[PDB]
């Protein structure tokens, strides 16, 4: 298996045939882990020699699957839910159970603090529309979403405030200051929100990032999201602005220390000093772990993001 | 000698004492080559053992100077210039003679073509003033000149059109497509224009580049400009906008293939589609070698520069 | 071979079959000369008898290929371009080498002088749009570009000032006043700018010229540009207005004596005597050989072009 963080994953099916030869990096086996099922890519090209794995198998990590050729709280409220009407006791899927356990751990073990803010993105939206036009009449086949600008702004903010690109230990006594900047971006698949991770966001440009995002969003909404494309995230951006919620307080995505939720952009009046100009404010909200970061550092971080997205030219400085 | 392109340079004086110990990278010896006299830096720290070089010596390359411890055209018009008045036959300095020979070679051997253009830099100037304010009230001690934005725009244009980051041979039959992007920026010292080279402009940010430029401009205007800080340039930017010349046609700086001259920014009316808005147009002029580049490629290059400087946000894409 | 100016051209391939019979004037053989590869047309119709030429042959002029049936300057700067980064020493194609040699001869042997000018073409553009509409609803399948009006204006100017329709000798002592008016128009093929020549521009109308131009532009951009369609030019029009460069100084296309570069039309304010009316100015630039023409004659020529294109009705006078 090329890259699983160390969880025992149960196979669902395989992609190959006895005698088939596989391309450079394409699907061979789907395995149903956490978040969503992942398709192992190919390491190289070659015809099949081993069905060392089959349909229904299970691998924890680095197993040869293919050879080729080339205190005392009250209990939950016991209620007879059927005495008031008709019920239907559905049972949560395994990914739903796992996500619930992960969130119930992050809620207890992380002291959350949520700073809300609003970013004037009128210029950013005008520029994004202009670049979506220019990238059309030049036949690039790329769509620049408002999320890649936020990824760049958050990468800049992690460059300036490296305390936010950290992670605590089990006991919460040793920090892990990361020097790389990967950012997960919560994509909405029919099976809930999955977080694919984009690597080295601080270096890549907005068009390369936009191509990566346009690819991986579809890769997730289809279910073919490959492992390693959901591991090693330093930060999370949960954008639900396409649906509403003028603000919301997300949950920190352990083992990270912060998460930026993005809301629906709205045209609001802004005081220019003498009158109310109609600008387009985007409500962001930084929910962070209070053990690593304090209120002032969260304030400086979200105001760095606000300044960067307010005038995107600050990404070249 | 740490880095001379292979020219025999004559020493002027030394910077050290018998027994003195020198710092990491500071002056040891000044040598009067082409363009301007260069101060050899230190390779390391250590007390003096050899005055292997002295005052008045001459080195062509890699000489141990210190050991430490730790067809038929008409002739020129023969005129008796004194029969009309009083004259004074001054003789050109050695750097003036060398620069004249270099320019008289570049004029003959290079077919120049000069494309003029005007760039709407109203937004760029507003943003530069805003960042000069913000970099003051935050005590950065940096001054962001309009030239670093042009360096970034030219680096972007060399990324997009790599044919401009080239160099021809003696016979003009083999090109040398360079992959690095260094840009010389003509600084005006009391001894004329010297071109110091800034390396990897495509990667560095505008504030790092602005610090480099603020340092090396003074380093040149004082004369302490070190070698290697004037070698390996892929492009040249000759900015004379501080003096006038609404346009000018520079001479290609061999062995490069192009040079961008910059003129004085002026507030001109621009057709927005229905009226004349007063914008701030900066006149640029790309003078390039016709043997490598043709008129259409020069047009695309200067319009890439014009688009980048017109909306600097295109540096993040 | 029907028409090569006297250069030894190397064959690339043939267009026919043993037994095939060829039409009136269509492709038989492609030969890779200067500027671009040319397809020899047919002189007549008839079935094949000789493969007197083959694939890879070479002809200098009039060879039977088919029978049918029916002082001391400094050297170039020696730089080790790899000590600053990674390079890639590509070698120029044969057409690039030839064009570089031609331009490096024209630069030395021709004293260039470039007169810039701006032409009010508001009426001309309105009339061209009107005729493009009228030539559509009448099903002519012709597109009238702004370049045919410039060809007509330059033909008129060559009629009025016949000194510009000239050519010098090797020694530059005997002029050759041409009486015909052919005009090359620099078309932009993927292999650079090629100049196809349109004959007797002074007589043909704008719709016939527009059909010729629409045909030969595609003929060049595809590579099927036939010889004789790039020979015998009295003048050159290099139009790069589709790309930018508000002005540019082209290189005289020897053995001609002048060249008109055309830039991007822009809406500028023009003094009507009492106010600034927004007109559409087209920046032209006449670069001419100073040995034949002087500054005043160039001024009169470019002002004739400016007057003609300013009010195109002067083409009937």
PDB file of N, CA and C in Angstrom, chain B residues 3 5 101-102 105 107-117 163 167-170 173-180 182 199 231-232 254-255 269 271 276 290-291 294 296 299-300 302-303 306, chain C residues 73-79 81-92 96-97 100 103-104 107-109 116 188 192-193 240 243-251 264 267-269 278:
ATOM      1  N   UNK B   3      35.024  35.692  -7.804  1.00  0.00           N
ATOM      2  CA  UNK B   3      34.198  35.574  -9.037  1.00  0.00           C
ATOM      3  C   UNK B   3      34.383  36.731 -10.028  1.00  0.00           C
ATOM      4  N   UNK B   5      34.355  37.112 -14.374  1.00  0.00           N
ATOM      5  CA  UNK B   5      33.944  36.366 -15.554  1.00  0.00           C
ATOM      6  C   UNK B   5      35.079  35.937 -16.466  1.00  0.00           C
ATOM      7  N   UNK B 101      33.506  50.636 -26.415  1.00  0.00           N
ATOM      8  CA  UNK B 101      33.783  49.483 -27.264  1.00  0.00           C
ATOM      9  C   UNK B 101      32.655  48.462 -27.190  1.00  0.00           C
ATOM     10  N   UNK B 102      32.137  48.214 -25.986  1.00  0.00           N
ATOM     11  CA  UNK B 102      31.043  47.263 -25.831  1.00  0.00           C
ATOM     12  C   UNK B 102      29.798  47.729 -26.572  1.00  0.00           C
ATOM     13  N   UNK B 105      30.202  47.411 -30.266  1.00  0.00           N
ATOM     14  CA  UNK B 105      30.033  46.036 -30.721  1.00  0.00           C
ATOM     15  C   UNK B 105      28.562  45.642 -30.738  1.00  0.00           C
ATOM     16  N   UNK B 107      26.011  47.549 -31.118  1.00  0.00           N
ATOM     17  CA  UNK B 107      25.286  48.243 -32.173  1.00  0.00           C
ATOM     18  C   UNK B 107      25.437  47.529 -33.508  1.00  0.00           C
ATOM     19  N   UNK B 108      26.654  47.106 -33.841  1.00  0.00           N
ATOM     20  CA  UNK B 108      26.890  46.463 -35.126  1.00  0.00           C
ATOM     21  C   UNK B 108      26.325  45.049 -35.137  1.00  0.00           C
ATOM     22  N   UNK B 109      26.679  44.242 -34.139  1.00  0.00           N
ATOM     23  CA  UNK B 109      26.393  42.816 -34.190  1.00  0.00           C
ATOM     24  C   UNK B 109      24.946  42.467 -33.877  1.00  0.00           C
ATOM     25  N   UNK B 110      24.161  43.393 -33.342  1.00  0.00           N
ATOM     26  CA  UNK B 110      22.791  43.122 -32.931  1.00  0.00           C
ATOM     27  C   UNK B 110      21.850  43.942 -33.802  1.00  0.00           C
ATOM     28  N   UNK B 111      20.935  43.323 -34.540  1.00  0.00           N
ATOM     29  CA  UNK B 111      19.868  44.097 -35.182  1.00  0.00           C
ATOM     30  C   UNK B 111      18.793  44.474 -34.180  1.00  0.00           C
ATOM     31  N   UNK B 112      18.761  45.735 -33.767  1.00  0.00           N
ATOM     32  CA  UNK B 112      17.838  46.162 -32.727  1.00  0.00           C
ATOM     33  C   UNK B 112      16.463  46.445 -33.303  1.00  0.00           C
ATOM     34  N   UNK B 113      15.432  46.093 -32.543  1.00  0.00           N
ATOM     35  CA  UNK B 113      14.079  46.556 -32.821  1.00  0.00           C
ATOM     36  C   UNK B 113      13.461  46.984 -31.502  1.00  0.00           C
ATOM     37  N   UNK B 114      12.836  48.157 -31.495  1.00  0.00           N
ATOM     38  CA  UNK B 114      12.342  48.772 -30.273  1.00  0.00           C
ATOM     39  C   UNK B 114      10.833  48.908 -30.354  1.00  0.00           C
ATOM     40  N   UNK B 115      10.128  48.235 -29.454  1.00  0.00           N
ATOM     41  CA  UNK B 115       8.679  48.333 -29.347  1.00  0.00           C
ATOM     42  C   UNK B 115       8.342  49.218 -28.159  1.00  0.00           C
ATOM     43  N   UNK B 116       7.619  50.298 -28.404  1.00  0.00           N
ATOM     44  CA  UNK B 116       7.219  51.176 -27.320  1.00  0.00           C
ATOM     45  C   UNK B 116       5.836  50.785 -26.820  1.00  0.00           C
ATOM     46  N   UNK B 117       5.550  51.132 -25.569  1.00  0.00           N
ATOM     47  CA  UNK B 117       4.262  50.792 -24.990  1.00  0.00           C
ATOM     48  C   UNK B 117       4.022  51.674 -23.778  1.00  0.00           C
ATOM     49  N   UNK B 163      11.887  32.305 -24.636  1.00  0.00           N
ATOM     50  CA  UNK B 163      12.775  32.688 -25.726  1.00  0.00           C
ATOM     51  C   UNK B 163      13.494  33.998 -25.438  1.00  0.00           C
ATOM     52  N   UNK B 167      20.468  33.718 -25.175  1.00  0.00           N
ATOM     53  CA  UNK B 167      21.725  34.361 -25.523  1.00  0.00           C
ATOM     54  C   UNK B 167      22.300  33.656 -26.740  1.00  0.00           C
ATOM     55  N   UNK B 168      22.815  34.442 -27.676  1.00  0.00           N
ATOM     56  CA  UNK B 168      23.411  33.904 -28.887  1.00  0.00           C
ATOM     57  C   UNK B 168      24.909  33.707 -28.712  1.00  0.00           C
ATOM     58  N   UNK B 169      25.494  32.976 -29.653  1.00  0.00           N
ATOM     59  CA  UNK B 169      26.924  32.729 -29.652  1.00  0.00           C
ATOM     60  C   UNK B 169      27.650  33.765 -30.505  1.00  0.00           C
ATOM     61  N   UNK B 170      28.972  33.607 -30.574  1.00  0.00           N
ATOM     62  CA  UNK B 170      29.812  34.481 -31.383  1.00  0.00           C
ATOM     63  C   UNK B 170      29.324  34.517 -32.830  1.00  0.00           C
ATOM     64  N   UNK B 173      24.621  31.257 -34.230  1.00  0.00           N
ATOM     65  CA  UNK B 173      24.000  30.054 -34.760  1.00  0.00           C
ATOM     66  C   UNK B 173      23.447  29.120 -33.698  1.00  0.00           C
ATOM     67  N   UNK B 174      23.864  29.255 -32.442  1.00  0.00           N
ATOM     68  CA  UNK B 174      23.399  28.399 -31.359  1.00  0.00           C
ATOM     69  C   UNK B 174      22.855  29.272 -30.241  1.00  0.00           C
ATOM     70  N   UNK B 175      21.588  29.071 -29.901  1.00  0.00           N
ATOM     71  CA  UNK B 175      20.984  29.779 -28.786  1.00  0.00           C
ATOM     72  C   UNK B 175      21.328  29.085 -27.472  1.00  0.00           C
ATOM     73  N   UNK B 176      21.163  29.816 -26.372  1.00  0.00           N
ATOM     74  CA  UNK B 176      21.405  29.292 -25.029  1.00  0.00           C
ATOM     75  C   UNK B 176      20.190  29.631 -24.174  1.00  0.00           C
ATOM     76  N   UNK B 177      19.181  28.766 -24.211  1.00  0.00           N
ATOM     77  CA  UNK B 177      17.967  28.989 -23.434  1.00  0.00           C
ATOM     78  C   UNK B 177      18.278  28.829 -21.955  1.00  0.00           C
ATOM     79  N   UNK B 178      18.344  29.943 -21.235  1.00  0.00           N
ATOM     80  CA  UNK B 178      18.575  29.900 -19.803  1.00  0.00           C
ATOM     81  C   UNK B 178      17.284  29.565 -19.071  1.00  0.00           C
ATOM     82  N   UNK B 179      17.420  28.844 -17.960  1.00  0.00           N
ATOM     83  CA  UNK B 179      16.277  28.490 -17.132  1.00  0.00           C
ATOM     84  C   UNK B 179      16.177  29.334 -15.871  1.00  0.00           C
ATOM     85  N   UNK B 180      17.271  29.940 -15.432  1.00  0.00           N
ATOM     86  CA  UNK B 180      17.240  30.887 -14.333  1.00  0.00           C
ATOM     87  C   UNK B 180      16.815  32.255 -14.847  1.00  0.00           C
ATOM     88  N   UNK B 182      17.746  36.003 -13.825  1.00  0.00           N
ATOM     89  CA  UNK B 182      18.414  37.121 -13.180  1.00  0.00           C
ATOM     90  C   UNK B 182      18.177  38.367 -14.017  1.00  0.00           C
ATOM     91  N   UNK B 199      19.461  38.079  -8.625  1.00  0.00           N
ATOM     92  CA  UNK B 199      19.327  36.681  -8.995  1.00  0.00           C
ATOM     93  C   UNK B 199      17.976  36.123  -8.570  1.00  0.00           C
ATOM     94  N   UNK B 231      27.255  40.229 -12.598  1.00  0.00           N
ATOM     95  CA  UNK B 231      27.481  39.157 -13.606  1.00  0.00           C
ATOM     96  C   UNK B 231      26.296  38.186 -13.637  1.00  0.00           C
ATOM     97  N   UNK B 232      26.085  37.550 -14.793  1.00  0.00           N
ATOM     98  CA  UNK B 232      25.024  36.583 -14.982  1.00  0.00           C
ATOM     99  C   UNK B 232      23.639  37.186 -15.048  1.00  0.00           C
ATOM    100  N   UNK B 254      24.398  43.122 -24.594  1.00  0.00           N
ATOM    101  CA  UNK B 254      24.966  41.798 -24.937  1.00  0.00           C
ATOM    102  C   UNK B 254      25.605  41.202 -23.680  1.00  0.00           C
ATOM    103  N   UNK B 255      25.610  39.865 -23.486  1.00  0.00           N
ATOM    104  CA  UNK B 255      25.098  38.900 -24.462  1.00  0.00           C
ATOM    105  C   UNK B 255      23.615  38.592 -24.317  1.00  0.00           C
ATOM    106  N   UNK B 269      -5.213  60.804 -20.229  1.00  0.00           N
ATOM    107  CA  UNK B 269      -6.586  60.310 -20.340  1.00  0.00           C
ATOM    108  C   UNK B 269      -6.621  58.964 -21.040  1.00  0.00           C
ATOM    109  N   UNK B 271      -9.379  55.875 -22.470  1.00  0.00           N
ATOM    110  CA  UNK B 271     -10.752  55.594 -22.868  1.00  0.00           C
ATOM    111  C   UNK B 271     -11.261  54.388 -22.091  1.00  0.00           C
ATOM    112  N   UNK B 276     -13.113  59.639 -20.791  1.00  0.00           N
ATOM    113  CA  UNK B 276     -11.665  59.662 -20.606  1.00  0.00           C
ATOM    114  C   UNK B 276     -11.369  59.773 -19.117  1.00  0.00           C
ATOM    115  N   UNK B 290      16.881  41.288 -32.973  1.00  0.00           N
ATOM    116  CA  UNK B 290      15.975  40.747 -34.022  1.00  0.00           C
ATOM    117  C   UNK B 290      16.415  39.353 -34.488  1.00  0.00           C
ATOM    118  N   UNK B 291      17.667  38.961 -34.225  1.00  0.00           N
ATOM    119  CA  UNK B 291      18.123  37.651 -34.674  1.00  0.00           C
ATOM    120  C   UNK B 291      17.452  36.538 -33.882  1.00  0.00           C
ATOM    121  N   UNK B 294      11.503  37.966 -32.999  1.00  0.00           N
ATOM    122  CA  UNK B 294      10.893  38.704 -34.089  1.00  0.00           C
ATOM    123  C   UNK B 294       9.898  39.711 -33.526  1.00  0.00           C
ATOM    124  N   UNK B 296       6.690  39.950 -33.602  1.00  0.00           N
ATOM    125  CA  UNK B 296       5.513  39.427 -32.923  1.00  0.00           C
ATOM    126  C   UNK B 296       5.843  38.944 -31.519  1.00  0.00           C
ATOM    127  N   UNK B 299       6.246  41.855 -29.370  1.00  0.00           N
ATOM    128  CA  UNK B 299       4.934  42.414 -29.067  1.00  0.00           C
ATOM    129  C   UNK B 299       4.262  41.646 -27.941  1.00  0.00           C
ATOM    130  N   UNK B 300       4.278  40.316 -28.023  1.00  0.00           N
ATOM    131  CA  UNK B 300       3.674  39.503 -26.975  1.00  0.00           C
ATOM    132  C   UNK B 300       4.388  39.702 -25.644  1.00  0.00           C
ATOM    133  N   UNK B 302       6.160  42.438 -24.570  1.00  0.00           N
ATOM    134  CA  UNK B 302       5.891  43.737 -23.975  1.00  0.00           C
ATOM    135  C   UNK B 302       4.430  43.851 -23.573  1.00  0.00           C
ATOM    136  N   UNK B 303       3.526  43.121 -24.229  1.00  0.00           N
ATOM    137  CA  UNK B 303       2.143  43.173 -23.778  1.00  0.00           C
ATOM    138  C   UNK B 303       1.926  42.312 -22.541  1.00  0.00           C
ATOM    139  N   UNK B 306       3.035  44.697 -19.972  1.00  0.00           N
ATOM    140  CA  UNK B 306       2.010  45.721 -19.827  1.00  0.00           C
ATOM    141  C   UNK B 306       0.823  45.203 -19.027  1.00  0.00           C
TER     142      UNK B 306
ATOM    143  N   UNK C  73      36.471  45.241 -33.314  1.00  0.00           N
ATOM    144  CA  UNK C  73      35.542  45.348 -32.202  1.00  0.00           C
ATOM    145  C   UNK C  73      35.789  44.235 -31.193  1.00  0.00           C
ATOM    146  N   UNK C  74      35.283  44.445 -29.983  1.00  0.00           N
ATOM    147  CA  UNK C  74      35.389  43.432 -28.949  1.00  0.00           C
ATOM    148  C   UNK C  74      34.573  42.199 -29.337  1.00  0.00           C
ATOM    149  N   UNK C  75      35.015  41.012 -28.936  1.00  0.00           N
ATOM    150  CA  UNK C  75      34.239  39.802 -29.222  1.00  0.00           C
ATOM    151  C   UNK C  75      33.004  39.724 -28.338  1.00  0.00           C
ATOM    152  N   UNK C  76      32.144  38.766 -28.668  1.00  0.00           N
ATOM    153  CA  UNK C  76      30.941  38.547 -27.881  1.00  0.00           C
ATOM    154  C   UNK C  76      31.320  38.202 -26.442  1.00  0.00           C
ATOM    155  N   UNK C  77      30.529  38.623 -25.453  1.00  0.00           N
ATOM    156  CA  UNK C  77      30.898  38.365 -24.055  1.00  0.00           C
ATOM    157  C   UNK C  77      30.943  36.884 -23.721  1.00  0.00           C
ATOM    158  N   UNK C  78      32.140  36.372 -23.447  1.00  0.00           N
ATOM    159  CA  UNK C  78      32.316  34.974 -23.071  1.00  0.00           C
ATOM    160  C   UNK C  78      31.848  34.797 -21.633  1.00  0.00           C
ATOM    161  N   UNK C  79      30.714  34.126 -21.453  1.00  0.00           N
ATOM    162  CA  UNK C  79      30.117  33.929 -20.139  1.00  0.00           C
ATOM    163  C   UNK C  79      29.831  32.448 -19.947  1.00  0.00           C
ATOM    164  N   UNK C  81      27.352  30.482 -18.692  1.00  0.00           N
ATOM    165  CA  UNK C  81      25.955  30.683 -18.332  1.00  0.00           C
ATOM    166  C   UNK C  81      25.437  29.651 -17.342  1.00  0.00           C
ATOM    167  N   UNK C  82      26.187  28.579 -17.092  1.00  0.00           N
ATOM    168  CA  UNK C  82      25.734  27.518 -16.204  1.00  0.00           C
ATOM    169  C   UNK C  82      26.146  27.733 -14.755  1.00  0.00           C
ATOM    170  N   UNK C  83      27.080  28.644 -14.488  1.00  0.00           N
ATOM    171  CA  UNK C  83      27.496  28.886 -13.112  1.00  0.00           C
ATOM    172  C   UNK C  83      26.460  29.666 -12.314  1.00  0.00           C
ATOM    173  N   UNK C  84      25.451  30.241 -12.970  1.00  0.00           N
ATOM    174  CA  UNK C  84      24.375  30.934 -12.276  1.00  0.00           C
ATOM    175  C   UNK C  84      23.101  30.110 -12.177  1.00  0.00           C
ATOM    176  N   UNK C  85      22.967  29.070 -12.989  1.00  0.00           N
ATOM    177  CA  UNK C  85      21.783  28.238 -12.941  1.00  0.00           C
ATOM    178  C   UNK C  85      21.870  27.147 -13.983  1.00  0.00           C
ATOM    179  N   UNK C  86      20.697  26.600 -14.318  1.00  0.00           N
ATOM    180  CA  UNK C  86      20.560  25.523 -15.333  1.00  0.00           C
ATOM    181  C   UNK C  86      20.217  26.168 -16.681  1.00  0.00           C
ATOM    182  N   UNK C  87      20.866  25.702 -17.751  1.00  0.00           N
ATOM    183  CA  UNK C  87      20.661  26.226 -19.088  1.00  0.00           C
ATOM    184  C   UNK C  87      20.213  25.088 -19.999  1.00  0.00           C
ATOM    185  N   UNK C  88      19.940  25.433 -21.255  1.00  0.00           N
ATOM    186  CA  UNK C  88      19.567  24.445 -22.265  1.00  0.00           C
ATOM    187  C   UNK C  88      19.944  25.031 -23.622  1.00  0.00           C
ATOM    188  N   UNK C  89      21.070  24.578 -24.172  1.00  0.00           N
ATOM    189  CA  UNK C  89      21.628  25.171 -25.387  1.00  0.00           C
ATOM    190  C   UNK C  89      20.913  24.592 -26.605  1.00  0.00           C
ATOM    191  N   UNK C  90      19.748  25.158 -26.901  1.00  0.00           N
ATOM    192  CA  UNK C  90      19.043  24.821 -28.130  1.00  0.00           C
ATOM    193  C   UNK C  90      19.749  25.487 -29.303  1.00  0.00           C
ATOM    194  N   UNK C  91      19.592  24.905 -30.485  1.00  0.00           N
ATOM    195  CA  UNK C  91      20.228  25.414 -31.690  1.00  0.00           C
ATOM    196  C   UNK C  91      19.164  25.928 -32.651  1.00  0.00           C
ATOM    197  N   UNK C  92      19.418  27.098 -33.229  1.00  0.00           N
ATOM    198  CA  UNK C  92      18.432  27.754 -34.076  1.00  0.00           C
ATOM    199  C   UNK C  92      18.215  26.965 -35.360  1.00  0.00           C
ATOM    200  N   UNK C  96      15.650  30.245 -38.982  1.00  0.00           N
ATOM    201  CA  UNK C  96      16.006  31.227 -37.966  1.00  0.00           C
ATOM    202  C   UNK C  96      17.418  31.748 -38.182  1.00  0.00           C
ATOM    203  N   UNK C  97      18.360  30.860 -38.509  1.00  0.00           N
ATOM    204  CA  UNK C  97      19.714  31.300 -38.831  1.00  0.00           C
ATOM    205  C   UNK C  97      19.720  32.237 -40.030  1.00  0.00           C
ATOM    206  N   UNK C 100      18.227  35.576 -39.121  1.00  0.00           N
ATOM    207  CA  UNK C 100      19.167  36.318 -38.303  1.00  0.00           C
ATOM    208  C   UNK C 100      20.292  36.920 -39.120  1.00  0.00           C
ATOM    209  N   UNK C 103      18.813  39.894 -41.073  1.00  0.00           N
ATOM    210  CA  UNK C 103      18.598  41.062 -40.229  1.00  0.00           C
ATOM    211  C   UNK C 103      19.913  41.677 -39.776  1.00  0.00           C
ATOM    212  N   UNK C 104      20.936  40.859 -39.527  1.00  0.00           N
ATOM    213  CA  UNK C 104      22.231  41.403 -39.147  1.00  0.00           C
ATOM    214  C   UNK C 104      22.945  42.050 -40.321  1.00  0.00           C
ATOM    215  N   UNK C 107      20.790  45.517 -40.622  1.00  0.00           N
ATOM    216  CA  UNK C 107      21.097  46.462 -39.556  1.00  0.00           C
ATOM    217  C   UNK C 107      22.372  47.233 -39.853  1.00  0.00           C
ATOM    218  N   UNK C 108      23.412  46.542 -40.312  1.00  0.00           N
ATOM    219  CA  UNK C 108      24.686  47.200 -40.568  1.00  0.00           C
ATOM    220  C   UNK C 108      24.614  48.052 -41.827  1.00  0.00           C
ATOM    221  N   UNK C 109      24.160  47.468 -42.934  1.00  0.00           N
ATOM    222  CA  UNK C 109      24.283  48.119 -44.230  1.00  0.00           C
ATOM    223  C   UNK C 109      23.259  49.220 -44.465  1.00  0.00           C
ATOM    224  N   UNK C 116       7.551  58.182 -36.436  1.00  0.00           N
ATOM    225  CA  UNK C 116       6.304  57.696 -35.877  1.00  0.00           C
ATOM    226  C   UNK C 116       5.174  58.659 -36.216  1.00  0.00           C
ATOM    227  N   UNK C 188       1.801  36.310 -39.466  1.00  0.00           N
ATOM    228  CA  UNK C 188       2.372  35.645 -38.297  1.00  0.00           C
ATOM    229  C   UNK C 188       2.001  34.167 -38.345  1.00  0.00           C
ATOM    230  N   UNK C 192       7.136  32.133 -36.893  1.00  0.00           N
ATOM    231  CA  UNK C 192       7.558  33.515 -36.998  1.00  0.00           C
ATOM    232  C   UNK C 192       6.788  34.291 -38.046  1.00  0.00           C
ATOM    233  N   UNK C 193       7.346  35.442 -38.406  1.00  0.00           N
ATOM    234  CA  UNK C 193       6.726  36.322 -39.384  1.00  0.00           C
ATOM    235  C   UNK C 193       7.268  36.011 -40.771  1.00  0.00           C
ATOM    236  N   UNK C 240       1.445  44.587 -36.176  1.00  0.00           N
ATOM    237  CA  UNK C 240       1.416  43.891 -34.901  1.00  0.00           C
ATOM    238  C   UNK C 240       0.408  44.531 -33.950  1.00  0.00           C
ATOM    239  N   UNK C 243      -1.517  42.722 -31.090  1.00  0.00           N
ATOM    240  CA  UNK C 243      -0.809  42.289 -29.896  1.00  0.00           C
ATOM    241  C   UNK C 243      -0.426  43.419 -28.952  1.00  0.00           C
ATOM    242  N   UNK C 244      -0.259  44.645 -29.444  1.00  0.00           N
ATOM    243  CA  UNK C 244       0.071  45.757 -28.570  1.00  0.00           C
ATOM    244  C   UNK C 244       1.072  46.719 -29.175  1.00  0.00           C
ATOM    245  N   UNK C 245       2.073  47.103 -28.380  1.00  0.00           N
ATOM    246  CA  UNK C 245       3.170  47.988 -28.854  1.00  0.00           C
ATOM    247  C   UNK C 245       2.605  49.252 -29.509  1.00  0.00           C
ATOM    248  N   UNK C 246       2.160  50.203 -28.684  1.00  0.00           N
ATOM    249  CA  UNK C 246       1.641  51.488 -29.141  1.00  0.00           C
ATOM    250  C   UNK C 246       2.528  52.162 -30.186  1.00  0.00           C
ATOM    251  N   UNK C 247       3.821  51.843 -30.209  1.00  0.00           N
ATOM    252  CA  UNK C 247       4.686  52.161 -31.337  1.00  0.00           C
ATOM    253  C   UNK C 247       5.809  51.141 -31.383  1.00  0.00           C
ATOM    254  N   UNK C 248       6.438  51.026 -32.548  1.00  0.00           N
ATOM    255  CA  UNK C 248       7.647  50.224 -32.644  1.00  0.00           C
ATOM    256  C   UNK C 248       8.411  50.612 -33.897  1.00  0.00           C
ATOM    257  N   UNK C 249       9.725  50.395 -33.853  1.00  0.00           N
ATOM    258  CA  UNK C 249      10.643  50.807 -34.910  1.00  0.00           C
ATOM    259  C   UNK C 249      11.124  49.576 -35.663  1.00  0.00           C
ATOM    260  N   UNK C 250      10.477  49.203 -36.763  1.00  0.00           N
ATOM    261  CA  UNK C 250      10.871  47.979 -37.466  1.00  0.00           C
ATOM    262  C   UNK C 250      12.206  48.116 -38.173  1.00  0.00           C
ATOM    263  N   UNK C 251      12.685  47.024 -38.760  1.00  0.00           N
ATOM    264  CA  UNK C 251      13.925  47.007 -39.524  1.00  0.00           C
ATOM    265  C   UNK C 251      13.569  46.952 -41.001  1.00  0.00           C
ATOM    266  N   UNK C 264      -1.437  49.079 -32.307  1.00  0.00           N
ATOM    267  CA  UNK C 264      -2.813  48.880 -31.877  1.00  0.00           C
ATOM    268  C   UNK C 264      -3.573  50.201 -31.903  1.00  0.00           C
ATOM    269  N   UNK C 267      -8.446  54.634 -28.665  1.00  0.00           N
ATOM    270  CA  UNK C 267      -9.328  55.793 -28.654  1.00  0.00           C
ATOM    271  C   UNK C 267      -8.670  56.897 -27.839  1.00  0.00           C
ATOM    272  N   UNK C 268      -8.269  57.967 -28.517  1.00  0.00           N
ATOM    273  CA  UNK C 268      -7.576  59.087 -27.911  1.00  0.00           C
ATOM    274  C   UNK C 268      -8.341  60.382 -28.147  1.00  0.00           C
ATOM    275  N   UNK C 269      -8.186  61.368 -27.271  1.00  0.00           N
ATOM    276  CA  UNK C 269      -8.804  62.671 -27.525  1.00  0.00           C
ATOM    277  C   UNK C 269      -8.031  63.436 -28.584  1.00  0.00           C
ATOM    278  N   UNK C 278     -13.365  62.296 -28.982  1.00  0.00           N
ATOM    279  CA  UNK C 278     -12.692  60.995 -28.907  1.00  0.00           C
ATOM    280  C   UNK C 278     -12.603  60.318 -30.262  1.00  0.00           C
TER     281      UNK C 278
END
